Design a protein around this ligand. Structure first.
Ligand SMILES: *[C@@H]1O[C@H](CO)[C@@H](O[C@@H]2O[C@H](CO)[C@@H](O[C@@H]3O[C@H](CO)[C@@H](O)[C@H](O[C@H]4O[C@H](CO)[C@@H](O)[C@H](O)[C@@H]4O[C@H]4O[C@H](CO)[C@@H](O)[C@H](O)[C@@H]4O)[C@@H]3O)[C@H](O)[C@H]2NC(C)=O)[C@H](O)[C@H]1NC(C)=O
Ligand SMILES: *[C@@H]1O[C@H](CO)[C@@H](O[C@@H]2O[C@H](CO)[C@@H](O)[C@H](O)[C@H]2NC(C)=O)[C@H](O)[C@H]1NC(C)=O
Ligand SMILES: *[C@@H]1O[C@H](CO)[C@@H](O)[C@H](O)[C@H]1NC(C)=O
Ligand SMILES: *[C@@H]1O[C@H](CO)[C@@H](O)[C@H](O)[C@H]1NC(C)=O
Ligand SMILES: *[C@@H]1O[C@H](CO)[C@@H](O)[C@H](O)[C@H]1NC(C)=O
Ligand SMILES: *[C@@H]1O[C@H](CO)[C@@H](O)[C@H](O)[C@H]1NC(C)=O
Ligand SMILES: *[C@@H]1O[C@H](CO)[C@@H](O)[C@H](O)[C@H]1NC(C)=O
Ligand SMILES: *[C@@H]1O[C@H](CO)[C@@H](O)[C@H](O)[C@H]1NC(C)=O
Ligand SMILES: *[C@@H]1O[C@H](CO)[C@@H](O)[C@H](O)[C@H]1NC(C)=O
Ligand SMILES: *[C@@H]1O[C@H](CO)[C@@H](O)[C@H](O)[C@H]1NC(C)=O
Ligand SMILES: *[C@@H]1O[C@H](CO)[C@@H](O)[C@H](O)[C@H]1NC(C)=O
Ligand SMILES: *[C@@H]1O[C@H](CO)[C@@H](O)[C@H](O)[C@H]1NC(C)=O
Ligand SMILES: *[C@@H]1O[C@H](CO)[C@@H](O)[C@H](O)[C@H]1NC(C)=O
Lengths: 107, 569
């Protein structure tokens, strides 16, 4: 099983700034890393598909990229609606493991 | 009394030309996987420039405008590029066992078809079922329940990738450096002939690549009145493009919800089709306000009467035939609607109930779009209630005998939709070099780009810098961008080479040693410099230009360079 980590484990920022969450793999996965947004008490929804491909309905404020083992999610012009826990998942090889998640508090 | 040839660089002279144009878009409009690939276009400038050309009258002809053919080529190439990396439905051409789905309710419009699919991935025949629209399935074996998918026998059906969006995004056309686009600003311009208010732009306004027939949607409206345009106009076999003064709001809908299922075709590939119907079954329809359409026809009839003399005008429905060409059509919401439109062309005007006209509409998935044979697209189900609320801004009419003219909704190819937006634009080629007589021998207020074009040669001659400071500086748009840059480079170097040989590489005004020959133009300098514009002069000198150039290089730079070579001693 490919082990996943994420950094920072706890993040906070004010409305309108730009933040970065980095998801790290023990082994390379090409571009096959998905990003999800989980609201407290709700199931997550996917934000980014193959590392950089954004899901329709998600505003352009959510950007991402990277390859190999180090990937980033960049959230520009942070909004109150962006409060929640972000997760990253590898689709390259089975099991499709997840990182521990990053909690984003909005101030 | 002796006049000498002098070379000018930056002459506001243009000639008609056909060139490759490149695209631009509003980078802050901006979804990817859009069929129009607008993310590959150069971002537009917030400042559009727009220089009004005083004293310039230009001849515009919408029916021979290369920009329309170029746009059609780009639109078709973009569709083929977008659809290419998608699932082919070749394995899906199988015998369908179809029964009517029982239920303004529909009466047999949706069929429940069960068929068995042979799949490569495993030797496996699976009995699957799917829902299809009546227009998607062609009956076979007489009265048997056997059907096939429409156009399978004539084309290879390509499934559109569900991630592909069909939303129109305005596309700006921009001339390569060294070329310019002239825009006609006449309020009642009829599409042909002279235009008085002509402005120069680098890029056109945004054009929404809306694909429709009979009625023009979105786009742009006329400013003063309804304008009816044609080519010969006498010839009944010519499309009449009607641009409206005020838009008509048309609200089309597909009230059914449905669900979507995926039937695997092969590894990594599946057929996306309609599943169980959620909710009741209601006919798709479109609501257009009656009073607004009534006034729209009143204005159209007035203009048609003015151009066709005081004859009776009657609007009829289009002749029966293939729904793709005899019905109004559009791709609103990602689904493809075909609407009857008869209620809009069913009245005699010569010289009463219901606030809204409801047009029945039918949904089709297998589309032989662009009037081609051998290709077809399958649009996956959207699974949603499509509220459209689009603007009608123009009509395409055709003409067919007791003193009455009969008009039908219709048109030719999709080009008619784009002329409506490109009618005011012309692409021209700038040739910044020219020659003129002056009194000087070598003896070894600003308006913007081409703003002096309508001025006399004098007064215009002090703005040559304005043009000199201009000119220069893997999909469809990438290649066209590459061709545009290479063309601009080639033209800049041709001009620089000509200036280099003459002996004028560093000057906007360059004096030569070649005397002026009275046979070229037997006119005094005041008759030339204070009467003619640079374009009239260039046309007048167009028969002797190669002679002047031959004399200037031969006698001025291959002899100056030999006389100087001898004088050093
Ligand atoms: C002429 O102009 C009129 C007036 O503008 C045009 O009308 C607009 O039409 C568009 C196209 O439908 C419409 O935009 C939709 O608005 C919906 C409002 O509820 C949105 O829900 C919808 O978003 C979905 O589709 C988008 C395009 O695919 C996606 O970017 C977006 O993320 C959403 O995607 C969801 O749904 C799709 C379904 O296909 C699915 O694939 C995805 O997974 C996801 O579930 C659109 O933004 C505008 O609202 C209309 N404007 C008005 C004022 O009504 C009209 O279309 C033009 N005429 C023609 C002929 O094109
Ligand atoms: C269309 O036909 C399919 C058959 O392929 C229908 O499927 C049956 O539906 C009933 C209940 O409606 C179930 O009890 C059966 O088990 C289904 N059989 C299958 C899937 O083989 C389907 O209901 C019909 N759908 C519509 C929209 O009419
Ligand atoms: C294929 O389907 C038809 C009805 O559509 C059925 O009569 C036939 O038996 C099926 N054959 C196989 C091999 O599944
Ligand atoms: C002429 O064209 C310019 C283009 O900028 C426009 O602003 C102006 O109103 C037009 N005038 C007339 C009389 O058409
Ligand atoms: C449609 O017409 C309305 C009329 O009020 C206008 O506000 C709207 O911007 C128009 N939409 C388009 C896409 O042209
Ligand atoms: C216009 O159409 C008429 C049809 O009567 C034809 O005689 C005429 O030659 C046409 N003229 C042009 C310029 O197309
Ligand atoms: C489709 O779903 C909507 C959800 O609001 C519902 O109102 C509508 O009636 C449904 N359509 C039909 C035809 O039942
Ligand atoms: C269209 O008009 C009819 C009139 O009965 C109405 O019932 C229907 O809801 C309208 N449809 C839309 C999409 O507004
Ligand atoms: C279309 O729907 C809009 C919804 O805001 C409504 O205002 C408008 O009157 C409708 N037009 C027609 C022609 O029914
Ligand atoms: C529309 O014009 C026709 C012309 O014959 C007239 O009979 C009809 O009553 C008018 N309808 C409205 C709603 O103005
Ligand atoms: C055309 O319009 C006339 C108007 O009198 C009508 O009688 C006729 O049925 C319409 N349709 C055709 C196909 O002629
Ligand atoms: C439009 O509806 C009328 C209703 O009488 C029908 O006769 C006509 O054939 C329909 N047109 C098309 C193109 O289906
Ligand atoms: C066309 O107008 C006539 C006028 O008598 C009317 O009877 C007929 O129903 C109209 N056509 C449609 C499709 O409603």
């Amino acid at each position: 099983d490919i082990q996943m980590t994420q950094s920072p484990s706890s993040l906070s920022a004010s409305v309108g700034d730009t933040v970065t969450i980095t998801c790290r793999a023990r082994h390379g996965v090409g571009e096959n890393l998905n990003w999800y947004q989980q609201k407290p008490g709700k199931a997550p929804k996917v934000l980014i598909y193959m590392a950089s491909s954004r899901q329709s309905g998600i505003p352009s404020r959510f950007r991402g990229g990277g390859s190999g083992t180090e990937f980033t999610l960049t959230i520009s012009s942070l909004q109150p609606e962006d409060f929640g826990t972000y997760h990253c998942q590898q689709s390259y090889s089975y099991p499709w493991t997840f990182g521990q998640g990053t909690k984003v508090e909005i101030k | 009394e002796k006049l000498w040839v002098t070379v000018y660089y930056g002459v506001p002279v243009w000639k008609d030309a056909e060139t490759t144009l490149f695209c631009a878009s509003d980078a802050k409009a901006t979804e990817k996987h859009n069929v129009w690939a607008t993310h590959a276009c150069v971002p537009t400038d917030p400042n559009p420039q727009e220089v009004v050309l005083e004293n310039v009258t230009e001849h515009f002809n919408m029916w021979k405008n290369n920009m329309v053919e170029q746009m059609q080529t780009d639109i078709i190439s973009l569709w083929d590029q977008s659809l290419k990396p998608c699932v082919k439905l070749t394995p899906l051409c199988v015998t369908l066992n179809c029964k009517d789905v029982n239920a303004t309710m529909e009466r047999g419009e949706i069929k429940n078809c069960s068929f068995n699919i042979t799949t490569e991935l495993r030797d496996k025949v699976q009995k699957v079922y799917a829902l299809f629209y009546k227009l998607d399935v062609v009956p076979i074996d007489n009265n048997n329940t056997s059907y096939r998918l429409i156009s399978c026998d004539t084309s290879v059906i390509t499934q559109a990738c569900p991630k592909i969006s069909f939303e129109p995004i305005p596309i700006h056309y921009c001339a390569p450096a060294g070329f310019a686009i002239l825009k006609c600003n006449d309020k009642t311009f009829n599409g042909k002939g002279p235009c008085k208010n002509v402005s120069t732009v680098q890029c056109t306004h945004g054009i929404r690549p809306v694909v429709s027939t009979q009625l023009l949607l979105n786009g742009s409206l006329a400013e003063e009145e309804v304008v009816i345009r044609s080519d010969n106009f006498t010839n009944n076999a010519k499309t009449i493009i009607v641009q409206l003064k005020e838009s008509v709001e048309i609200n089309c809908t597909r009230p059914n919800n449905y669900t979507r299922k995926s039937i695997r075709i092969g590894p990594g590939r599946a057929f996306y089709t309609m599943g169980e119907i959620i909710g009741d079954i209601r006919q798709a329809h479109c609501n257009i306000s009656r009073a607004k359409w009534n006034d729209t026809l009143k204005q159209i009839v007035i203009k048609l009467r003015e151009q066709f003399e005081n004859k009776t005008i009657v609007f009829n429905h289009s002749s029966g035939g293939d729904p793709e060409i005899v019905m109004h059509s559009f791709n609103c919401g990602g689904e493809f609607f075909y609407c009857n439109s008869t209620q809009l062309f069913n009245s005699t005007w010569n010289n009463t109930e219901g606030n809204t006209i409801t047009l029945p509409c039918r949904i089709k998935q297998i589309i032989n779009m662009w009037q081609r044979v051998g290709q077809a697209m399958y649009a996956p189900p959207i699974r949603g209630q499509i509220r459209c609320s689009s603007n009608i801004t123009g009509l395409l009419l055709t003409r067919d005998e007791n003193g009455t003219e009969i008009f039908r909704p219709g048109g030719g190819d999709m080009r008619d939709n784009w002329r409506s937006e490109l009618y005011k634009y012309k692409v021209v080629k700038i040739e910044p070099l020219g020659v003129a007589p002056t009194r000087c021998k070598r003896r070894v207020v600003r308006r913007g780009f081409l703003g002096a074009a309508g001025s006399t040669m004098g007064a215009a001659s002090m703005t040559l810098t304005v043009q000199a400071r201009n000119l220069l500086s893997l999909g469809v748009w990438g290649i066209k961008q590459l061709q545009a840059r290479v063309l601009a480079v080639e033209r800049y170097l041709r001009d620089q080479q000509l200036l280099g040989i003459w002996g004028c590489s560093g000057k906007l005004i360059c004096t030569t040693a070649v005397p002026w020959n009275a046979s070229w133009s037997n006119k005094s300098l005041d008759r030339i410099w204070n009467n003619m514009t640079w374009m009239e002069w260039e046309r007048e000198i167009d028969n002797y230009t190669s002679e002047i150039y031959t004399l200037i290089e031969e006698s001025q730079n291959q002899q100056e360079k030999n006389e100087q070579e001898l004088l050093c001693l």
